[PDB]
Amino acid sequence: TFNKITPNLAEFAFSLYRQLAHQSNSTNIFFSPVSIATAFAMLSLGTKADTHDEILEGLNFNLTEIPEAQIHEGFQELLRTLNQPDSQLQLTTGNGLFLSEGLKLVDKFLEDVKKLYHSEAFTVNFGDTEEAKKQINDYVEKGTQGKIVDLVKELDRDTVFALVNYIFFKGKWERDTEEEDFHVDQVTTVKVPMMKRLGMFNIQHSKKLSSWVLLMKYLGNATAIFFLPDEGKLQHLENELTHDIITKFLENEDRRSASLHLPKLSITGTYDLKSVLGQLGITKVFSNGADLSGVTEEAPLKLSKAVHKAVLTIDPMSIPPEVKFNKPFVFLMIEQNTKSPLFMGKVVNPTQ
Ligand SMILES: CCC[C@@H](NC(=O)c1ccc2oc(=O)[nH]c2c1)[C@@H](O)c1ccccc1C
Rounded distance from Cα 90 to ligand 1 centre (Å)? 15
Atom of ligand 1 nearest to the CA of 177: 12
Q: Which of 15, 14, 60, 58 is nearest to 245 (CA)?
A: 14
Residue nearest to atom 15 of ligand 1 (CA): 264
Domain boundary among 248, 263, 278: 263
Rounded distance from Cα 328 to ligand 1 centre (Å)? 14
Pocket test for ligand 1, best of 264, 343, 344, 348 (most atoms within 8 A of CB): 264
Task: Kindly state whether residue 241 falls inside one of the protein's structural domains.
Answer: yes
- Cβ neighbourhood burial of 240 (10 Å; 0-12, 13-18, 19+): middle
Alpha carbon distance 7, 49 (integer Å): 24
Task: Kindly state whether residue 344 falls inside one of the protein's structural domains.
Answer: no
**Together in a domain, 154 and 49:** yes
Alpha carbon distance 240, 208 (integer Å): 8
Ligand 1 in reach of 201 Cβ (< 6 A): no
- Cβ neighbourhood burial of 22 (10 Å; 0-12, 13-18, 19+): exposed
**Together in a domain, 221 and 72:** no
Residue nearest to atom 8 of ligand 1 (CA): 264
**Together in a domain, 141 and 243:** no
Looking at residue 300, the DSSP 8-state letter turns out to be: -
Task: Kindly state whether residue 337 falls inside one of the protein's structural domains.
Answer: no
Pocket test for ligand 1, best of 168, 182, 195 (most atoms within 8 A of CB): 195
Q: Which domain holds residue 56?
A: 1-173+264-317
Ligand 1 in reach of 325 Cβ (< 6 A): yes
Ligand 1 in reach of 264 Cβ (< 6 A): yes
**Together in a domain, 143 and 192:** no
**Strands, DSSP E only, in the chain?**
29-31, 91-100, 120-124, 161-171, 178-185, 188-206, 211-218, 222-229, 256-263, 267-272, 305-314, 322-324, 329-335, 341-347
Domain boundary among 247, 263, 279: 263
Ligand 1 in reach of 217 Cβ (< 6 A): no
**CA 297 to mean position of chain CA atoms:** 32
Q: Which of 98, 265, 68 is nearest to 179 (CA)?
A: 265
Task: Kindly state whether residue 326 falls inside one of the protein's structural domains.
Answer: no
Task: Kindly state whether residue 345 falls inside one of the protein's structural domains.
Answer: no
Q: Which of 120, 6, 165, 166 is nearest to 74 (CA)?
A: 6
**Together in a domain, 202 and 309:** no
**Together in a domain, 34 and 114:** yes
Phi then psi dihedrals of residue 35, to 5 deg: -70, -40
**Together in a domain, 214 and 90:** no
Ligand 1 in reach of 171 Cβ (< 6 A): yes
Q: Which technique was the structure solved with, according to the deposited record?
A: X-ray
State the DSSP H helix or E strand holding residue 8, giving kind and residue range, or none if neither: helix 6-23
Ligand 1 in reach of 224 Cβ (< 6 A): yes
Ligand 1 in reach of 195 Cβ (< 6 A): yes
**Together in a domain, 49 and 138:** yes
**Together in a domain, 187 and 309:** no
Rounded distance from Cα 349 to ligand 1 centre (Å)? 15
Task: Kindly state whether residue 336 falls inside one of the protein's structural domains.
Answer: no
Alpha carbon distance 40, 52 (integer Å): 10
Q: How many structural domains compose the chain?
A: 2
Rounded distance from Cα 264 to ligand 1 centre (Å)? 5
**Together in a domain, 7 and 142:** yes
Task: Kindly state whether residue 338 falls inside one of the protein's structural domains.
Answer: no
**Together in a domain, 258 and 180:** yes
Alpha carbon distance 228, 322 (integer Å): 13
**Together in a domain, 147 and 13:** yes
Task: Kindly state whether residue 103 falls inside one of the protein's structural domains.
Answer: yes
- Cα angle 13-200-217, degrees, rounded to a multiple of 5: 35
Residue nearest to atom 7 of ligand 1 (CA): 264
**CA 181 to mean position of chain CA atoms:** 28
